[PDB]
Amino acid sequence: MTPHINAKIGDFYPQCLLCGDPLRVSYIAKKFLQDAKEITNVRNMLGFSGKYKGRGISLMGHGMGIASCTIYVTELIKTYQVKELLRIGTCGAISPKVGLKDIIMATGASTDSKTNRVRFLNHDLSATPDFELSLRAYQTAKRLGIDLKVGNVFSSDFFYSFETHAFDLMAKYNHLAIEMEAAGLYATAMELNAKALCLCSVSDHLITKEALSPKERVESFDNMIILALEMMS
Amino acid sequence: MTPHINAKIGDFYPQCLLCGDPLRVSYIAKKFLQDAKEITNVRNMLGFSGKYKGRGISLMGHGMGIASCTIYVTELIKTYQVKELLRIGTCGAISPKVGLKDIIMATGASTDSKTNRVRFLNHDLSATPDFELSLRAYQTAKRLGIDLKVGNVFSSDFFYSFETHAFDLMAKYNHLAIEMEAAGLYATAMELNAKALCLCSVSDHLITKEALSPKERVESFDNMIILALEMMS
Amino acid sequence: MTPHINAKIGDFYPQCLLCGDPLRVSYIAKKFLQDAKEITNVRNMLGFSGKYKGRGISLMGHGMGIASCTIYVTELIKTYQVKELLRIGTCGAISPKVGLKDIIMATGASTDSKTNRVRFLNHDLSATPDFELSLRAYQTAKRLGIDLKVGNVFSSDFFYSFETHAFDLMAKYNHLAIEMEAAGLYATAMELNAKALCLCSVSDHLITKEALSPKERVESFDNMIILALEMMS
Amino acid sequence: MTPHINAKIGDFYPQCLLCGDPLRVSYIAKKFLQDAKEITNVRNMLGFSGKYKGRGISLMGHGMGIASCTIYVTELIKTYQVKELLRIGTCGAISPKVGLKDIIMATGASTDSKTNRVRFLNHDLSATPDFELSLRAYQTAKRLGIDLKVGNVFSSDFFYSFETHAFDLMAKYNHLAIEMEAAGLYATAMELNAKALCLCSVSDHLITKEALSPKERVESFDNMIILALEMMS
Amino acid sequence: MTPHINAKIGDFYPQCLLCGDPLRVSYIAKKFLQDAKEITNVRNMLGFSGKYKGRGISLMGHGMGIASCTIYVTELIKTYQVKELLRIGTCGAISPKVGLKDIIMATGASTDSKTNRVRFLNHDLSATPDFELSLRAYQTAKRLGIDLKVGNVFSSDFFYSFETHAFDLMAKYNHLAIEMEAAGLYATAMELNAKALCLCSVSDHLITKEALSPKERVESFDNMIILALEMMS
Amino acid sequence: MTPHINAKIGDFYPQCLLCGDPLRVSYIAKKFLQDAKEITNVRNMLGFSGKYKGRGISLMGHGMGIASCTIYVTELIKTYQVKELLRIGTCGAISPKVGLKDIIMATGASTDSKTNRVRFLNHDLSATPDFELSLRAYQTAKRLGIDLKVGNVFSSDFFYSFETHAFDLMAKYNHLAIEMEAAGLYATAMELNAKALCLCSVSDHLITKEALSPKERVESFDNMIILALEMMS
Ligand SMILES: Clc1nc(OCc2ccccc2)c2[nH]cnc2n1
Ligand SMILES: Clc1nc(OCc2ccccc2)c2[nH]cnc2n1
Ligand SMILES: Clc1nc(OCc2ccccc2)c2[nH]cnc2n1
Ligand SMILES: [Mg+2]
Ligand SMILES: [Mg+2]
Ligand SMILES: [Mg+2]
């Protein structure tokens, strides 16, 4: 076992979809998987194993923030032998290159965290996803007719930012959106030789203040779920 | 409502106990409170309001890590008008002065996070609790005959540490244990002029290699919980 | 001996009151102690041993700035076996919560120094006083009818600040006043397992530009001296 | 004209290959291009324009180190309207996954430079290439039967390193090799909204202690050069 | 008057010798100057004005550490119109090129302080003396037959060091000795457009373990003192 | 050999003049040296050995930026046994104390590079030239009737600065001009126990926007060349 997961070793398939919100994980298990079994529930952070088009797939919640994400991803890789980790979530757009309902593939994750300096010699770690996984996402999106937006995201320790004046500067350097875990997902997978990728759905635009209707939010997140499950099968 | 709490304004009493684990919050509501009502459940992060010896008290989960804690504490203060926040968490002992299941009161919370440098001019913010709450904790512990251990804690972005060499230095500087939220609780309550304190029970021990099960991390710490409820009565 | 103190080992009592100004130390020895003996005078930095209400008490000057304070405190603890160190001084108020003649108890000391990053793994050390000593100060102040103001102070390397625009931000985070040694006193005592506390008297308000009359400055500092000597006896 | 390029505006095609060594640039012009013309030679840093299979392609030297690279890339983009920049450099292998003369495509460029902290709010900029160019490189390599190694590189300010202990950690985090310009190329192209990619051939090997001669660093990498020209056709 | 000097404006000559120890300043006044008058004594930090071979020269103590030194130097320049400041201090040798009682002239002062990063855009300020004063020191030493050692010093916030491993690296980079004020003297005089130089005599030796008594640190360095007075005549 | 120099060991004289621009090195060899032999040309970075007034002197190009300069200087010292390195170049004035055509002697080199923090314990290295060499430059300039301007320079990683608002602050702290290599030259020579000095010619004033005519630029650089060759003979 671990302190944060009470699944049996072997309960997880080697491919795992992750979301910060464990109720979104539950929703995916119930709506999209066949024969879905809840396999962990410590701290109400739910994980499941089921089948998608006959393919075994696991789902796991990771909470909010780099430190929370790093706990679960570390345990999934080191204890539960998970090999491929696809994070899907929402993000707040900061770039004119993206709009509401877009799906972003993060080919880099910048951060205001100290975690990668602590990991990496007090230097600048370029936190990046597995290239083959990003290729698979691109080819699957084209097959599904999804216009995948590709660029960096900014992973913040702050949901309520003290640096909103800086969003334009991040957009200048090709940061399409802000979220709070990708840099930790990527650095952990890099450390532990696992394949990881982050996709995020634009439900809010932090510049133009636009926001999706609650029904639209379900629809756009559903399209992201289908993309994720298709690239893992 | 906030993006992470779906309570109505006014559902929270001005005094609130916090745990990272919403199931420890649920345990406390069911075991120790009268007329307890679940008031929020976004992302499965439960919160409750109820009575202890006729006094209204709220409970709220804050998830794992400074970024998660800061989100919930910020919303509790600014939207739900919470005035006193008492974290009753778990921690890993690094000092030979403390043992498994000891209760520590954090007179300061050091950190490897960048959040306080971002908050505070890139200088050293010494994150500290409210002194009146600390005095109340000390006096209540004396009244109840509880041996309260008092010192700093170190709040890390890492549970699985890359600086295991460094725990002895931490302990030398009177850090009794490591956990992952106190510095964020303290800095947020400082920012927002609210009263906060962190108590934690030792669930893991660097020196003895003891570690509690997930069930024990919920159920083994009634002495902490009773201390907290008695402080807020 | 040491390079900076020429007292005999054993000349110091285990409890020592400190001030930056050695002439203030001399004043205390002459006005408040019985049988006071000058025991060190290297670099004109005077220290004394005498009796207060039959209690042996030492006094020692520590100069200005964290680096100066750290030299004397290190020597007092390691060579002269001093166990409890109470620093009293003036400070410049930056918070609307305090006014001229207030006495502040510093339960944390933030800093713009690099000293604690050098001491503490390049992380954020929360520099804090000994809790039991702060309890003793609080109980003694209540016995004497002193309205003790409690909060953080900011210990600066700069008397003539280049960051005056930032005072409001420090006051927001519960820094009541600025001085130049507390963070070094606290970190040194933490390193060396000694008990330390800092009190400071508000003789100037850096925001409202108010300032005490020279006679008022003597009176307010006298009240602080009495509080200190009473808590050590 | 610019202080470092004496070409006429319009002399550069929109697609440009880059090497740190202007004599590798000269070699490519003479060996692989039709109707090649030298278009700039300030500071002996040569650049050319010519044709490959009827398609116009430019070549430009960028010197050694991030500061040198940033100068030339900034001018190529802002003054000479270059749109796509493909570095084909050399690097020192630090990972057992790669061997001498292997071709690496840098999916990210970590660094010990301060340039990106200066650019990017003192946070961590994850310096990354254009994804479309990366896909083009991958697909062209597959078409040509070239075994393209894919991972991060570490861009250092040092060729003769003071952190030789640290190469193993770099390699653990999937840094295949060390070189000295990719992070600057990537950050400058991000700043200026241009498409950039870095390929490098292994000219030195940490583990085997192999190292090529200066002549071999010009002449030994035709497979890299052909990959690059085929990508831009 | 200033908070730390109670001289009248005009009491200081434009040329001033500085020591950290006010009793070394007093020693110089009594032993080497004609008609010496004590002009300031706040906090027992003495200063004098007198004549050497008919030329007016002032002396002033600056206490221990960069923060203390910066206070006195700032006031001497801005209020008392001092133009040339010559520190004649003590230092701990870390290089085998120097021996006990050697006189070092600090061509640069490296530091572990944050003060210069705070002053200077968070970049590296290379703190250096006035070149004309350095030339004067060199030429006067030659004239007097004094073997002046020339190199960098390292100005630390610590006398009792936590980086004893690091002294050999310091010495490799031509740091002959460690002391605690030169970088602050140099940075303050740079800020304020005044001429400053630091000479120091070796009072402690890392390699031989030699260390002088407090009395010897006042009385053993007449050769330094005579060099300084001859330079300012 | 080395990767970046193809001269024979022994081809270099122990005294070497350096410039960033290898065509300026060529110009010096052709116009001012007797019997000049080109001895290296890797990457078109030319170096020469010849005679000046019967004195053997070498010349070597070092490219732009600290990282480039550090490669060549390291190789010159460690492989080719060069003992004295005099860098001459142009610089952009930022101080009212200097004007067009002035020659500056840099007695310190500040920087925005991370290189000296990486070299030097994450502290502040005061990067300084060899004092005897600076003496020789001063005495030679006086003999030649040159009004040598003496002060710090600022060595930047950025030719196209993002911090132009800060030039006035650097001028305040006695930075007379900006260039891009001196801090690296100085730190490398300090590490490796070689004698180094940087002179620079003011061809542009970055404040007043003044600029020398192309013919004046040749004349002023010629005067600097003569000063350099005279101090090495
Ligand atoms: Cl960071 C952290 N680490 C824990 O245990 C692991 C550990 C134990 C000893 C030394 C260092 C780390 C915790 N147990 C409860 N909260 C915790 N937070
Ligand atoms: Cl920084 C750098 N170092 C190289 O080789 C030296 C080396 C080899 C192995 C480990 C570390 C350093 C390079 N070869 C081509 N470009 C290079 N850039
Ligand atoms: Cl920081 C300092 N340390 C001294 O001696 C202790 C020492 C000796 C050798 C290596 C390191 C530290 C001094 N003696 C006079 N001024 C001094 N400043
Ligand atoms: Mg989400
Ligand atoms: Mg005082
Ligand atoms: Mg030049």
mmCIF file of C-alpha atoms in Angstrom, chain D residues 36-232:
data_model
loop_
_atom_site.group_PDB
_atom_site.id
_atom_site.type_symbol
_atom_site.label_atom_id
_atom_site.label_comp_id
_atom_site.label_asym_id
_atom_site.label_seq_id
_atom_site.Cartn_x
_atom_site.Cartn_y
_atom_site.Cartn_z
ATOM 1 C CA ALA D 36 25.090 29.309 -53.117
ATOM 2 C CA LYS D 37 25.989 32.950 -52.405
ATOM 3 C CA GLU D 38 27.737 34.282 -49.300
ATOM 4 C CA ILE D 39 25.417 37.011 -47.992
ATOM 5 C CA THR D 40 27.058 38.073 -44.708
ATOM 6 C CA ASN D 41 30.501 37.894 -43.102
ATOM 7 C CA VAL D 42 30.677 40.323 -40.156
ATOM 8 C CA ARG D 43 33.102 39.016 -37.512
ATOM 9 C CA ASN D 44 33.819 36.112 -39.900
ATOM 10 C CA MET D 45 30.358 34.742 -39.042
ATOM 11 C CA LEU D 46 29.313 33.584 -42.491
ATOM 12 C CA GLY D 47 25.833 33.160 -43.892
ATOM 13 C CA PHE D 48 24.625 31.951 -47.278
ATOM 14 C CA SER D 49 21.564 31.642 -49.474
ATOM 15 C CA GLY D 50 21.120 28.951 -52.080
ATOM 16 C CA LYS D 51 18.872 26.200 -53.365
ATOM 17 C CA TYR D 52 18.253 22.583 -52.381
ATOM 18 C CA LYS D 53 16.243 20.601 -54.948
ATOM 19 C CA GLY D 54 15.014 23.901 -56.335
ATOM 20 C CA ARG D 55 13.891 25.248 -52.924
ATOM 21 C CA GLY D 56 15.497 28.378 -51.478
ATOM 22 C CA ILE D 57 17.275 27.811 -48.146
ATOM 23 C CA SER D 58 19.533 30.066 -46.087
ATOM 24 C CA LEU D 59 22.354 29.133 -43.686
ATOM 25 C CA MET D 60 23.751 31.259 -40.879
ATOM 26 C CA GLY D 61 26.403 30.808 -38.165
ATOM 27 C CA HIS D 62 25.465 31.757 -34.597
ATOM 28 C CA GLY D 63 28.704 31.390 -32.577
ATOM 29 C CA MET D 64 29.059 29.678 -29.212
ATOM 30 C CA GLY D 65 26.823 30.168 -26.171
ATOM 31 C CA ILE D 66 23.339 31.507 -25.475
ATOM 32 C CA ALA D 67 24.355 35.183 -25.596
ATOM 33 C CA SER D 68 25.934 34.798 -29.050
ATOM 34 C CA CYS D 69 23.062 32.694 -30.387
ATOM 35 C CA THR D 70 20.456 35.158 -29.088
ATOM 36 C CA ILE D 71 22.156 38.033 -30.937
ATOM 37 C CA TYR D 72 22.055 36.352 -34.346
ATOM 38 C CA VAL D 73 18.601 34.809 -33.939
ATOM 39 C CA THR D 74 17.114 38.115 -32.774
ATOM 40 C CA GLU D 75 18.457 39.896 -35.864
ATOM 41 C CA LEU D 76 17.473 37.114 -38.285
ATOM 42 C CA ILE D 77 13.866 37.298 -37.088
ATOM 43 C CA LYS D 78 13.328 41.014 -36.514
ATOM 44 C CA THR D 79 15.340 42.461 -39.400
ATOM 45 C CA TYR D 80 15.715 39.684 -41.971
ATOM 46 C CA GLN D 81 12.159 38.277 -41.545
ATOM 47 C CA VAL D 82 13.293 34.679 -41.043
ATOM 48 C CA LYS D 83 10.331 32.505 -40.060
ATOM 49 C CA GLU D 84 11.744 29.001 -39.475
ATOM 50 C CA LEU D 85 15.106 28.410 -37.752
ATOM 51 C CA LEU D 86 16.612 24.930 -37.604
ATOM 52 C CA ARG D 87 19.786 24.588 -35.544
ATOM 53 C CA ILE D 88 21.950 21.615 -36.567
ATOM 54 C CA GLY D 89 24.711 21.683 -33.956
ATOM 55 C CA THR D 90 27.014 19.442 -31.925
ATOM 56 C CA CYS D 91 26.625 18.237 -28.352
ATOM 57 C CA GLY D 92 28.205 16.140 -25.616
ATOM 58 C CA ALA D 93 26.348 12.960 -24.769
ATOM 59 C CA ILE D 94 25.600 12.338 -21.084
ATOM 60 C CA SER D 95 23.085 9.475 -21.391
ATOM 61 C CA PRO D 96 23.798 5.785 -22.108
ATOM 62 C CA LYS D 97 20.798 5.865 -24.501
ATOM 63 C CA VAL D 98 22.912 7.631 -27.154
ATOM 64 C CA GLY D 99 26.236 7.107 -28.894
ATOM 65 C CA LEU D 100 28.830 9.096 -30.803
ATOM 66 C CA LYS D 101 27.411 10.666 -34.000
ATOM 67 C CA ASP D 102 23.782 9.977 -32.980
ATOM 68 C CA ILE D 103 21.360 12.754 -33.957
ATOM 69 C CA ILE D 104 19.261 14.174 -31.092
ATOM 70 C CA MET D 105 16.155 16.302 -31.416
ATOM 71 C CA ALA D 106 15.768 18.590 -28.384
ATOM 72 C CA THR D 107 12.136 18.497 -27.196
ATOM 73 C CA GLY D 108 13.150 20.923 -24.449
ATOM 74 C CA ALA D 109 16.284 22.787 -23.463
ATOM 75 C CA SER D 110 17.027 23.093 -19.751
ATOM 76 C CA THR D 111 19.718 25.592 -18.767
ATOM 77 C CA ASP D 112 22.053 26.967 -16.094
ATOM 78 C CA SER D 113 21.821 30.429 -17.730
ATOM 79 C CA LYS D 114 20.039 33.314 -15.986
ATOM 80 C CA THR D 115 18.748 34.619 -19.342
ATOM 81 C CA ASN D 116 15.322 33.025 -19.116
ATOM 82 C CA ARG D 117 14.785 34.099 -15.524
ATOM 83 C CA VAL D 118 15.620 37.628 -16.664
ATOM 84 C CA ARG D 119 13.178 37.242 -19.572
ATOM 85 C CA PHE D 120 10.394 35.565 -17.645
ATOM 86 C CA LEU D 121 9.512 37.136 -14.288
ATOM 87 C CA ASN D 122 12.272 35.241 -12.408
ATOM 88 C CA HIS D 123 10.118 32.110 -12.880
ATOM 89 C CA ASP D 124 10.930 28.861 -14.768
ATOM 90 C CA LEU D 125 10.460 29.271 -18.523
ATOM 91 C CA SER D 126 10.294 25.812 -20.090
ATOM 92 C CA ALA D 127 12.145 26.507 -23.356
ATOM 93 C CA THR D 128 10.634 24.370 -26.118
ATOM 94 C CA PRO D 129 10.716 24.098 -29.922
ATOM 95 C CA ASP D 130 7.895 24.618 -32.375
ATOM 96 C CA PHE D 131 5.809 21.436 -32.437
ATOM 97 C CA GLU D 132 5.149 21.462 -36.193
ATOM 98 C CA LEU D 133 8.892 21.609 -36.873
ATOM 99 C CA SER D 134 9.453 18.765 -34.399
ATOM 100 C CA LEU D 135 6.821 16.664 -36.164
ATOM 101 C CA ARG D 136 8.416 17.479 -39.528
ATOM 102 C CA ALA D 137 11.809 16.379 -38.215
ATOM 103 C CA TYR D 138 10.354 13.139 -36.845
ATOM 104 C CA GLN D 139 8.482 12.323 -40.071
ATOM 105 C CA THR D 140 11.415 13.194 -42.336
ATOM 106 C CA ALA D 141 13.757 11.047 -40.219
ATOM 107 C CA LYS D 142 11.328 8.129 -40.524
ATOM 108 C CA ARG D 143 11.094 8.653 -44.294
ATOM 109 C CA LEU D 144 14.905 8.663 -44.623
ATOM 110 C CA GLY D 145 15.498 5.749 -42.242
ATOM 111 C CA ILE D 146 17.462 7.882 -39.762
ATOM 112 C CA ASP D 147 17.301 6.829 -36.092
ATOM 113 C CA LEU D 148 16.435 10.132 -34.468
ATOM 114 C CA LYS D 149 17.010 10.249 -30.714
ATOM 115 C CA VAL D 150 14.415 12.376 -28.949
ATOM 116 C CA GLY D 151 14.660 14.024 -25.539
ATOM 117 C CA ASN D 152 15.751 17.114 -23.659
ATOM 118 C CA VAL D 153 19.159 18.733 -23.899
ATOM 119 C CA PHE D 154 20.809 20.865 -21.227
ATOM 120 C CA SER D 155 22.115 24.209 -22.542
ATOM 121 C CA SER D 156 25.051 25.343 -20.416
ATOM 122 C CA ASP D 157 27.113 28.505 -20.137
ATOM 123 C CA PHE D 158 30.058 26.121 -19.586
ATOM 124 C CA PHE D 159 31.835 23.734 -21.943
ATOM 125 C CA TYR D 160 34.396 22.765 -19.270
ATOM 126 C CA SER D 161 32.001 21.936 -16.462
ATOM 127 C CA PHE D 162 32.229 22.490 -12.698
ATOM 128 C CA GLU D 163 29.231 20.185 -12.110
ATOM 129 C CA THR D 164 30.474 16.900 -13.598
ATOM 130 C CA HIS D 165 28.812 15.195 -10.618
ATOM 131 C CA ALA D 166 25.464 16.472 -11.994
ATOM 132 C CA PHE D 167 25.468 14.930 -15.476
ATOM 133 C CA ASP D 168 24.038 11.660 -14.156
ATOM 134 C CA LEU D 169 21.104 13.534 -12.614
ATOM 135 C CA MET D 170 20.609 15.393 -15.911
ATOM 136 C CA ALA D 171 20.535 12.072 -17.764
ATOM 137 C CA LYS D 172 18.088 10.599 -15.242
ATOM 138 C CA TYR D 173 15.681 13.433 -16.144
ATOM 139 C CA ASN D 174 15.986 12.487 -19.841
ATOM 140 C CA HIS D 175 18.632 15.009 -20.860
ATOM 141 C CA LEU D 176 20.456 13.112 -23.593
ATOM 142 C CA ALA D 177 23.268 15.584 -24.140
ATOM 143 C CA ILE D 178 24.714 18.952 -23.195
ATOM 144 C CA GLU D 179 25.267 21.856 -25.606
ATOM 145 C CA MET D 180 25.258 25.643 -25.266
ATOM 146 C CA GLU D 181 22.652 27.396 -27.461
ATOM 147 C CA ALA D 182 19.305 25.547 -27.696
ATOM 148 C CA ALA D 183 17.656 27.229 -24.686
ATOM 149 C CA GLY D 184 18.561 30.643 -26.119
ATOM 150 C CA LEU D 185 17.342 29.742 -29.614
ATOM 151 C CA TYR D 186 14.087 28.452 -28.125
ATOM 152 C CA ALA D 187 13.504 31.384 -25.773
ATOM 153 C CA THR D 188 14.260 33.977 -28.469
ATOM 154 C CA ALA D 189 11.941 32.300 -30.984
ATOM 155 C CA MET D 190 9.240 32.152 -28.285
ATOM 156 C CA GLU D 191 9.709 35.868 -27.534
ATOM 157 C CA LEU D 192 9.479 36.788 -31.214
ATOM 158 C CA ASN D 193 6.776 34.330 -32.386
ATOM 159 C CA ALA D 194 9.039 32.389 -34.767
ATOM 160 C CA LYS D 195 9.329 28.623 -35.340
ATOM 161 C CA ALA D 196 12.548 27.028 -34.067
ATOM 162 C CA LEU D 197 13.984 23.545 -33.568
ATOM 163 C CA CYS D 198 17.386 22.238 -32.463
ATOM 164 C CA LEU D 199 18.976 19.039 -33.762
ATOM 165 C CA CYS D 200 22.491 18.154 -32.580
ATOM 166 C CA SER D 201 24.942 15.382 -33.420
ATOM 167 C CA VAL D 202 27.003 13.773 -30.643
ATOM 168 C CA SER D 203 30.638 14.944 -31.009
ATOM 169 C CA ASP D 204 31.816 14.089 -27.458
ATOM 170 C CA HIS D 205 30.727 11.353 -25.055
ATOM 171 C CA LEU D 206 30.824 11.545 -21.237
ATOM 172 C CA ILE D 207 30.726 7.789 -20.787
ATOM 173 C CA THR D 208 32.937 6.421 -23.579
ATOM 174 C CA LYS D 209 35.293 9.467 -23.488
ATOM 175 C CA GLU D 210 35.109 9.719 -27.295
ATOM 176 C CA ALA D 211 35.729 13.144 -28.853
ATOM 177 C CA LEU D 212 35.901 14.215 -32.505
ATOM 178 C CA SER D 213 38.536 16.440 -34.104
ATOM 179 C CA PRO D 214 37.705 19.975 -35.274
ATOM 180 C CA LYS D 215 37.721 18.735 -38.874
ATOM 181 C CA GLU D 216 35.364 15.888 -37.980
ATOM 182 C CA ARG D 217 32.938 18.315 -36.312
ATOM 183 C CA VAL D 218 32.523 19.963 -39.737
ATOM 184 C CA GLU D 219 32.554 16.929 -42.015
ATOM 185 C CA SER D 220 31.228 13.911 -40.042
ATOM 186 C CA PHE D 221 27.538 14.864 -39.838
ATOM 187 C CA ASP D 222 26.190 14.758 -43.399
ATOM 188 C CA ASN D 223 23.266 12.671 -42.164
ATOM 189 C CA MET D 224 22.152 15.556 -39.908
ATOM 190 C CA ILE D 225 22.626 18.039 -42.732
ATOM 191 C CA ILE D 226 20.632 15.950 -45.219
ATOM 192 C CA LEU D 227 17.864 15.454 -42.639
ATOM 193 C CA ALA D 228 17.678 19.217 -42.181
ATOM 194 C CA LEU D 229 17.640 20.037 -45.889
ATOM 195 C CA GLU D 230 15.000 17.379 -46.565
ATOM 196 C CA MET D 231 12.837 18.785 -43.749
ATOM 197 C CA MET D 232 12.921 22.268 -45.339
#
